[PDB]
Amino acid sequence: EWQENKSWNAHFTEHKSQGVVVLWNENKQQGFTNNLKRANQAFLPASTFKIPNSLIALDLGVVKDEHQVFKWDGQTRDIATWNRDHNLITAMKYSVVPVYQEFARQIGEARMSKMLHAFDYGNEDISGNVDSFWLDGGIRISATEQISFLRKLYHNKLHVSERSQRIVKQAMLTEANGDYIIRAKTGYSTRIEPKIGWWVGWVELDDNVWFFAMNMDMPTSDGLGLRQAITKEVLKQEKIIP
Amino acid sequence: EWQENKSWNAHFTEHKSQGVVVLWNENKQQGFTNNLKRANQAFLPASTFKIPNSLIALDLGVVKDEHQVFKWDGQTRDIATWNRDHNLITAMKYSVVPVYQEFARQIGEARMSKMLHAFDYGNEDISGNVDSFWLDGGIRISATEQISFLRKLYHNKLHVSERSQRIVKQAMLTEANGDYIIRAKTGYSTRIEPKIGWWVGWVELDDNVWFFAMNMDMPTSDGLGLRQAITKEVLKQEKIIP
Ligand SMILES: O=C(O)c1cccc(-c2nccs2)c1
Ligand SMILES: [Cl-]
Numbered sequence: 001e002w003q004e005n006k007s008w009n010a011h012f013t014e015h016k017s018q019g020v021v022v023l024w025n026e027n028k029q030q031g032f033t034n035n036l037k038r039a040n041q042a043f044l045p046a047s048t049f050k051i052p053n054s055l056i057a058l059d060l061g062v063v064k065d066e067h068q069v070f071k072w073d074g075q076t077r078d079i080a081t082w083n084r085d086h087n088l089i090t091a092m093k094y095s096v097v098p099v100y101q102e103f104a105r106q107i108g109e110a111r112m113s114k115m116l117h118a119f120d121y122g123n124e125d126i127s128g129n130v131d132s133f134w135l136d137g138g139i140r141i142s143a144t145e146q147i148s149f150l151r152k153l154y155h156n157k158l159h160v161s162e163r164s165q166r167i168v169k170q171a172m173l174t175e176a177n178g179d180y181i182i183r184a185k186t187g188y189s190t191r192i193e194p195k196i197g198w199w200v201g202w203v204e205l206d207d208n209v210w211f212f213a214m215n216m217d218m219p220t221s222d223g224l225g226l227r228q229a230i231t232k233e234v235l236k237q238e239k240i241i242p
Numbered sequence: 243e244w245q246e247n248k249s250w251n252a253h254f255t256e257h258k259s260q261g262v263v264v265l266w267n268e269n270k271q272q273g274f275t276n277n278l279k280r281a282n283q284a285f286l287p288a289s290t291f292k293i294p295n296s297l298i299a300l301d302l303g304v305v306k307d308e309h310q311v312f313k314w315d316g317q318t319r320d321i322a323t324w325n326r327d328h329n330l331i332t333a334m335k336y337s338v339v340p341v342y343q344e345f346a347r348q349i350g351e352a353r354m355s356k357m358l359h360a361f362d363y364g365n366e367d368i369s370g371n372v373d374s375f376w377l378d379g380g381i382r383i384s385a386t387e388q389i390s391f392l393r394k395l396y397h398n399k400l401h402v403s404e405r406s407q408r409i410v411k412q413a414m415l416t417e418a419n420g421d422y423i424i425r426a427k428t429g430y431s432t433r434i435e436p437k438i439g440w441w442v443g444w445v446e447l448d449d450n451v452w453f454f455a456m457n458m459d460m461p462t463s464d465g466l467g468l469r470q471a472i473t474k475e476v477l478k479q480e481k482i483i484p
Binding site: 090093162163166167170173174175176177178181204206 | 331332335404405408409412415416417418419423448
């Protein structure tokens with residue numbers, strides 16, 4: 001139920017890159033990747049952790065709903081879109097770390113740990129700062145593990161309210177047209193080597209769902225756009241999107 | 243509160259057509275239209291009725307959720323996409339009338355009439371056949387009334403569970419990208435004169451929401467693409483979308 005398609009490596013080599021794309025066909029219950037080993041290598045989730053962090057904040061009432069405004073703390077930061085008020089949707093859209101670091105502080109060490117165990121999330125280890133462990137702490141998760149987690153989310157099978165899971169899946173909305181819907185989240189781990197970029201989510205089709213999880217060596221922010229572009233090239237090759 | 247910009251009539255007359263666009267700025271509580279009379283003229287809702295119909299079906303348990311499969315009855319119809327199994331998402335996307343006719347029959351006359359009054363939906367008159375009144379029956383709704391209904395749906399203020407409204411708003415998803423999300427529903431009314439096409443919904447921005455409701459003369463199916471094409475050009479012109 002796992003095949004290695006090394007031809008996808010071209011899509012990484014065309015861009016002088018290195019990484020893995022993992023695809024999962026829900027209907028066929030069958031997985032596909034260019035590199036099974038990197039597919040099972042666990043990394044810092046970085047801002048892909050904003051998915052579980054959102055679920056937990058919502059289910060605990062830290063976030064009332066997707067319209068609640070989280071006021072800028074007035075601290076100017078070097079990402080302009082962070083220096084403004086946000087709600088859950090825009091916070092996820094722009095990967096606003098400081099808003100989610102506030103979520104985590106209010107969640108707390110004990111509840112965060114208990115919830116990630118309930119989620120069976122990666123290595124379930126939050127060692128480090130309660131408000132940065134997913135950027136430079138001990139938590140690790142692989143691409144195949146990201147998919148497993150996402151499959152539960154898609155099916156409302158995580159041990160949080162159906163409402164919390166619906167709200168996050170709405171916040172995850174990235175792209176939709178007449179051919180498909182993508183709900184996903186980007187990630188960018190920089191504080192601890194190796195620097196990598198993430199893209200995890202799923203593609204909704206009329207008759208199937210293709211879960212995906214990719215990470216790639218990201219020495220500089222210059223190549224961040226390759227997270228989505230390389231994934232789409234593979235999706236296009238496998239005839240999943242036009 | 244309202245403003246009429248007759249100039250916008252060019253959007254319709256340049257395609258040898260006539261119609262109305264109605265825009266509502268949620269933040270400013272302001273409305274805009276090319277034609278005040280036609281914005282308050284009531285037409286058959288046709289497939290835009292699948293919004294309230296889905297809400298009622300879900301809230302009464304006629305539809306369990308957006309994953310439940312409604313099996314094709316094996317009767318070949320002239321729309322290829324209708325000759326398939328469907329769920330709430332795809333039945334909305336393809337305006338699968340026979341799936342929603344079965345919804346109505348199970349909903350029943352009494353509960354249907356009573357929910358439409360609860361919704362304050364159009365003239366609230368289901369006279370005709372319970373499985374087709376929104377096609378050739380007595381119910382009517384205007385573009386402004388469509389907006390009054392959608393705004394309640396957005397704010398989860400309709401008299402159904404939040405879950406029912408979230409699910410229906412998920413099923414309304416039409417387009418999403420880095421700039422805006424459109425949730426909407428198309429309509430096409432041919433059984434009573436005048437033949438018209440609908441497009442109703444809203445566009446979600448980072449800092450605002452714009453509700454829209456449009457209908458336009460549709461003497462043949464050739465011009466159905468204009469329902470969304472014209473609307474988006476008004477949105478671009480008003481700089482609501484790039
Ligand atoms: O992709 C992401 O999740 C992400 C998260 C936070 C910051 C960034 C940055 N983008 C440019 C320079 S730092 C990206
Ligand atoms: Cl959605």
